[PDB]
Scaffold this active site. Sequence first.
Site, PDB file in Angstrom:
ATOM      1  N   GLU A 759      67.334  12.215  19.638  1.00 26.88           N
ATOM      2  CA  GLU A 759      66.100  11.862  18.916  1.00 26.88           C
ATOM      3  C   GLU A 759      65.096  11.638  19.866  1.00 26.88           C
ATOM      4  O   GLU A 759      64.586  10.443  19.847  1.00 26.88           O
ATOM      5  CB  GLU A 759      66.405  10.974  17.950  1.00 26.88           C
ATOM      6  N   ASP A 760      64.703  12.436  20.797  1.00 26.95           N
ATOM      7  CA  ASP A 760      63.571  12.555  21.624  1.00 26.95           C
ATOM      8  C   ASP A 760      63.764  11.574  22.754  1.00 26.95           C
ATOM      9  O   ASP A 760      62.815  10.593  22.844  1.00 26.95           O
ATOM     10  CB  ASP A 760      62.308  12.477  20.863  1.00 26.95           C
ATOM     11  N   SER A 761      64.642  11.391  23.418  1.00 29.40           N
ATOM     12  CA  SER A 761      65.013  10.720  24.388  1.00 29.40           C
ATOM     13  C   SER A 761      65.775  11.327  25.514  1.00 29.40           C
ATOM     14  O   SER A 761      66.018  12.441  25.295  1.00 29.40           O
ATOM     15  CB  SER A 761      65.952   9.358  24.015  1.00 29.40           C
ATOM     16  N   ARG A 932      61.113  22.418  17.283  1.00 29.06           N
ATOM     17  CA  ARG A 932      59.873  22.310  17.991  1.00 29.06           C
ATOM     18  C   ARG A 932      59.536  23.812  18.485  1.00 29.06           C
ATOM     19  O   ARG A 932      58.200  23.971  18.519  1.00 29.06           O
ATOM     20  CB  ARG A 932      60.034  21.499  19.248  1.00 29.06           C
TER      21      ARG A 932
END
Lengths: 1131, 117, 101, 101
Positions: A759-761, A932
Amino acid sequence: DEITPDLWQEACWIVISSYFDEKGLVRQQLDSFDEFIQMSVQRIVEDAPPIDLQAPPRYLLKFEQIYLSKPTHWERDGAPSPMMPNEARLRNLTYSAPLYVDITKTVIKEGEEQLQTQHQKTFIGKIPIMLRSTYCLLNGLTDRDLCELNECPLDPGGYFIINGSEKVLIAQEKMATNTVYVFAKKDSKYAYTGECRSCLENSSRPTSTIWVSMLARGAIGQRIVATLPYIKQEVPIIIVFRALGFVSDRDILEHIIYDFEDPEMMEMVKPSLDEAFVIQEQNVALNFIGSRGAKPGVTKEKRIKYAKEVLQKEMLPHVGVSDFCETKKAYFLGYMVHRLLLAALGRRELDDRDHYGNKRLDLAGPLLAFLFRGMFKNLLKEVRIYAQKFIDRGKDFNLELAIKTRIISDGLKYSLATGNWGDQKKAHQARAGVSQVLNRLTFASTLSHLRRLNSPIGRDGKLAKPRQLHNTLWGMVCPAETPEGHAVGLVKNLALMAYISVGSQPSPILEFLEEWSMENLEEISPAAIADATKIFVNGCWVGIHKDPEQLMNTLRKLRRQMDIIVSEVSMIRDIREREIRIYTDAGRICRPLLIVEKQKLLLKKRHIDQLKEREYNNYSWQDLVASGVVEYIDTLEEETVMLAMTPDDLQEKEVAYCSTYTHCEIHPSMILGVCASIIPFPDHNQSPRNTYQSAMGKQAMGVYITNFHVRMDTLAHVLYYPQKPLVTTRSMEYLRFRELPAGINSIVAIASYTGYNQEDSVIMNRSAVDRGFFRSVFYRSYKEQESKKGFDQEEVFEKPTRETCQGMRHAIYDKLDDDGLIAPGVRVSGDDVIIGKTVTLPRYTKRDCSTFLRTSETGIVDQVMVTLNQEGYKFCKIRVRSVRIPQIGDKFASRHGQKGTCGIQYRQEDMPFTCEGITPDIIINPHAIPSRMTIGHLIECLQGKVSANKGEIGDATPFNDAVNVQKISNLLSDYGYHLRGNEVLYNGFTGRKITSQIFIGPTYYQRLKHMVDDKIHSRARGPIQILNRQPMEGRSRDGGLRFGEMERDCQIAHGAAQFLRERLFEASDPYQVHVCNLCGIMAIANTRTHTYECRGCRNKTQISLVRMPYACKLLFQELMSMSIAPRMMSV
Amino acid sequence: PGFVGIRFCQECNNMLYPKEDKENRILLYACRNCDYQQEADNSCIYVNKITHEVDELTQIIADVSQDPTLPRTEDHPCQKCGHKEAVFFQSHSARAEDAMRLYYVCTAPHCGHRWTE
Amino acid sequence: PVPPLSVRPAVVMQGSARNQDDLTHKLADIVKINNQLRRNEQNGAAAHVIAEDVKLLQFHVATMVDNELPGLPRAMQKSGRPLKSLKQRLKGKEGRVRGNL
Amino acid sequence: HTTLRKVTANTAIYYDPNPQSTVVAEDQEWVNVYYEMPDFDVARISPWLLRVELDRKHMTDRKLTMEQIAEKINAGFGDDLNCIFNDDNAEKLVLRIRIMN
Ligand SMILES: [Zn+2]
Ligand SMILES: [Zn+2]
Ligand SMILES: [Zn+2]
């Protein structure tokens, strides 16, 4: 002779480089300011009327010439010295130059006793100077000279220094003036409205808007009205025409309808005639206008005079404000009515509010001109009062004492310092957001802030139309760079080759049109206007012509030869409607384009040859423009242009698309701005990703400026080891990203490793971080000054003492010196003291007012500077230095919108490794890619692997058919790697191969300003606000977090009533009051003597204690302030 | 039917309004500013084309053939001059729903013939 | 009713200059015009003068409890910022009820 | 909902002093076929005529006929507004109005 395709990619970029060698990135700011100083100030001074004052003797006081010296500074001794911008930054001065005006006062009393006294160079004010402008001391200096002055040679300039603060003027969008725009409001009494914001050439008043509307259907037909300025009632157009001296209906329709063979126009104007028949002469029409006005004179004489003055001055000033111009004004108002009828008859399209051909960019020059007009008018007013109070006594006066120069100086300084654009008294009518503090966080942020545009529609507005990316932004505004918050689409950014016109006078063009076969508007008969083509110049219909085609050919030849027409002049021929509109005014955004012959470029190979040796033969961009090979085309002239995206479009094809092109793109990638021009392969990303990167390149760390060692900025982040990207675009060569990059090439592996990057890490390499990977230094400057404002109380820097100082904290002051200032190299922790300041009292005769560190910083003092501020007391700046090593919670981003915080850091033995023991610097999660669709990230990673293995810099320029993924993969397979960028990795913990071959390679990552240590905050019974005894707001105030309405609603849904009471009563503001059981009003309690009594009821036994929030007690008291009786009845 | 145009007085140059002469039972056009009268020749006072059956060929002008941004075709020669090339474009005019119709104009100079397929 | 000092605290700045609340400045205007009207009724004053004084007192009280009256001029202060009346103290978001309770 | 405009092609006002010899040439057949017998008060006739032309497409799209239209006009305005019309056979769907006095 012809540039072949194989050479084109060089030729075009050679041309582009020449442009940026000539212009730069902040050319619009410098040209605007230069025009303002060279022309606008002089025009404003001369356009002011001479102030004739007399009791008898009389004086005129005519201002005739201006002189702006170089920036200087006056010390307390008064010695003028040349002030350098860095000295202004350090000493909190204003980088301004004095403006002197020549004044001529002639005495005229009687008997031809005349004598003139001229005061040469009367100091009229101080004007702040834009850096690197012509009137800047850094003008024309070499890089060696700038470095001698402690200036960065890469610094673009384009900003002001007001009180040491770098302020940048944001270009403000506005609807263009002197142009008729026919709109149609769905919810209004009018079906169609044709507006014209009219403003004279040399501005002296605001824009006078005139509307010419049609009443919505439902007396008999559709009536045309005209909402004139300074008149609060609609006026029929026929009445206005008669008030201008055209009484016969034939004359009025001669002025309105140019083709009498068209009964449709005729019947649509007929209702207006039928509504105005009782009024049939000029004086009666003027009386009607005056009566409909908001100041109806009881006597028709002054009514008619007022109507005359309105119709001569406020109605259409751009047509002419003098007398005998009624013919031109009548023709123009008839053109407005004609345009309205064409819209109502469907023969013309309604005008688009969003079309940038209909907009103008109010730059630094025209904005400072607005300020200067207001301020010079106020100054002349003050001079009038001062001189009047002296000549009323019948004696001479000194103009030097009449001129209080603080008006212009303090006005410009205040307006640029605060951003409130307007007079300081009208601080709410003034429009803020102009003149922002220059962003110095990274070089890209500075460039973008200097190329920033603003649409003042208002963020509150929820209509998406002005926020939409209009078609006409192509080449003028970056399609990507825009804030993603509440100002989507309103704050914009120039495209790289976008040039905002500075402005020019239409006099040579009008003179040539006179010498040419144009016919003036007063000399023609209206019968000729039918087949002829109208000619507008800056909105004014000046005449008509018979062959518009060869007129346009002549004018285009003239502009391409740098003859009387300058390059920035727009010349649009609308063919279907026979107008030819020429524009010379300022604010027109345009861009350069390659002109095209029959089907060939005019840019031959000889131009590229001369451009290659640009540094020897001084053949520059201006020689390319003067050769007639390049042309600046504005948004409105693009409508008449047929562009070729590349010279490949000019090739003869099996089916020709156009075959009649007129221009060509220099390169399509120039549609992007400064921050979008750093994205590699932006045409392989989803566009929101490109917008998010364009926003996040501005928070990226790097070296924001070369001379950062001497700047005392409040906040500054410098990266230890900035790297240029291995995969770059050809536009960063001009953004100077290679000389001041803002990131590091990281070996990034897109993998699922331990679950700490979900999650975007990201998972970073602790060993790499130990080696200086993405390490930065954070510089924080504290300012302080000791004020001797009066003998009542004076501050002073001195090491405080426990025996004399009163408000002295328990923190130790040993780190300070006897001068009261800490020394460089001293390690300072949170709450420590860096400046020992004491203020004399009216713990005796002096109180401690020392400056502490912003809590929880733990840096080292980088340096201490001491000087004197403008007024001249001691002034200190202390820069403290804190090394920020990346850690869990620090935000990082690639150039593709792929942001994330560090989830965990593993050492090199814990990270996964290739057969050749390469561990990734960063590991990002594969789940960040699919939704994305940042395929540019993957292509950049693969291109970067090829670049690193080949020893080159990858070309990621957006639209490049010579670079695709198959070529990059074939190149990578030549270096002994899987062609798609995958590698077998081994588990660092166990050493076993990972079943899925991981995608790994160099990608340019950025460290963003958002570090967790600047965000972490906690509270447990800290300070409280004064008004309502609730926790403060902010980390800096040691405040508490807001338990808001939505949290209250969530806990109500949970049913947690005691937790809700704890959060909203006991953890915020517990309080007790004493209430009278009879009247329910807060009583008077005396707990020491135990005497409780209500003055209202005159009882002292029936009082009750009530535990309520302090905010509720404050509410009830503020209601009692309003005569409301909130009676807390306990029964 | 055709539209009716405005006609102006011969003395005051104001518009003539319709009026009826009972004595001869005949239409007259008279000025309400001066005292002029005229014998009408059309007998029709008002015409409303609700259908809006307008020939847009009349709205086109030959000068549009000089537009570099219009498409050109060699497949529709000119019936008046025989030139091969011709520009074409759509109505793009309000109050015209079936506006996909193409209008052609001859690019030959001084011919300027306009037509529709 | 003039509220207590808690409702309108006089916050001390960095030095000794005690800054007064907007309510206190408004009450100062109200007391000024009230005393002025009291003397003008007690001593020599024209009827129109007393009328103007009463009008100004009305303006001050109204702008003390509600500053955004349509048409009327906003009660001003130093620096050209309008005063925050009792109504704006609790009118909506960031007021007492929504912002502090 | 269908108003007369939705089904109308074009309206016009003429000055017809005598209906026997109409201004238009193609409307002389049915006007005399209507006038040879006195159906209304010919004396209470005005020389101002209002000729409206319908269109077959919109007439058919609503299954409408001149009979219904004329009935609706003579109902909304009574006998004060005389209306006449031809059959639904002519190439142009036309109907003529006059004002009664
Ligand atoms: Zn009580
Ligand atoms: Zn007449
Ligand atoms: Zn032809």
